[PDB]
Structure of Kynurenine 3-monooxygenase:
Amino acid sequence: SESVAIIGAGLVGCLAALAFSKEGYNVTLYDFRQDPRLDTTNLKSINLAISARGIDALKSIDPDACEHILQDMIPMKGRMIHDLKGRQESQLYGEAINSINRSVLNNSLLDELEKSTTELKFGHKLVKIEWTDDKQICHFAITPHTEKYDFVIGCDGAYSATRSQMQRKVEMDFSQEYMNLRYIELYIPPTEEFKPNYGGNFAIAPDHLHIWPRHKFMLIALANSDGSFTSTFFGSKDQISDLITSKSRVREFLIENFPDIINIMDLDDAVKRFITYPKESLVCVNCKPYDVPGGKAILLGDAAHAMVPFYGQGMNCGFEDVRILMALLKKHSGDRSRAFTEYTQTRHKDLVSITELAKRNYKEMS
Ligand SMILES: Cc1cc2nc3c(=O)[nH]c(=O)nc-3n(C[C@H](O)[C@H](O)[C@H](O)COP(=O)(O)OP(=O)(O)OC[C@H]3O[C@@H](n4cnc5c(N)ncnc54)[C@H](O)[C@@H]3O)c2cc1C
């Protein structure tokens, strides 16, 4: 019965914590942010698209809770393209995706954890790790604090501190790249009345991923359960910077480029969101290997392969990481040293393809 320190209570980390509690490991999930469920309190997006692969990975870890967690997801049967004239054209789907709320999926995973042996330590920032040949010494900041574990699993985001600590122990080929891409989260409220055709209070087609393809920028919309739409604008930081110098400049920009949103969105609210948007940069990372030899550490999710939003699906990719790691662990009879090794040897070549294609689709647009 071994113990594991999982650094990062995000979607990937919480899932890994669930899959390691399922197998019998004494899991201890950490995160420097407070409990997201707590009212007194880190959402990069209101919702996201989960693929069949991301769903199958959910089932492989908990078939029961899966259909309970994903009970509010909305399937997309294709893309709905809005042109400059405001005309909509449907483009049916290769791989099916479903819209699901991020905070709900995150909280649901957390709830399933507290219904198990695992232990949740929020407000614990990992600062340092020392590597022995038996147990790893994890230093936190909450006020110094230290606990020892058999192995540490990093799921602490693109700026992974776990990754940095691993680099002091292993020769890691590592590359980080900051993109010009920026995103602004907008909101399309539900209609006042139920719409028979859409099957809810939706201003537009709920079973479609709406896209407003423009030159070097983009608007998208995913349906929420309550009828509203989570909307996201994608563009370079330069374009946005030039826009937000004037409320009228932003307002006239939206009307000109997305004329068919005037009936479904308050422009004054979108202008406000544009100007006061968190100017947070997007970074892409690649690692090799993802594991410390001896099976003492491993990287999953954005910590290992952070990629471009929309063009790449990081959550689905992160979920697939966990499922493959479990297949290997249950193929090598719990031998983490041999399982973590085969992970890198097989997962890296897939991740190289995925991240590059996503990066290639992005550079194409911009
Ligand atoms: C706008 C947007 C839209 C997206 N849409 C999709 C989509 O539709 N489909 C899809 O598959 N993906 C999508 N993604 C990507 C997806 O959100 C991420 O790839 C996914 O959340 C990865 O989760 P993670 O747990 O690996 O990293 P994170 O979500 O960042 O989790 C890391 C956690 O670790 C914690 N942490 C950080 N540092 C420390 C530390 N030093 N000590 C302790 N804890 C720490 C943080 O608090 C954080 O909660 C989107 C991303 C963005 C930005």
The first strand starts at residue 3 and ends at 7.
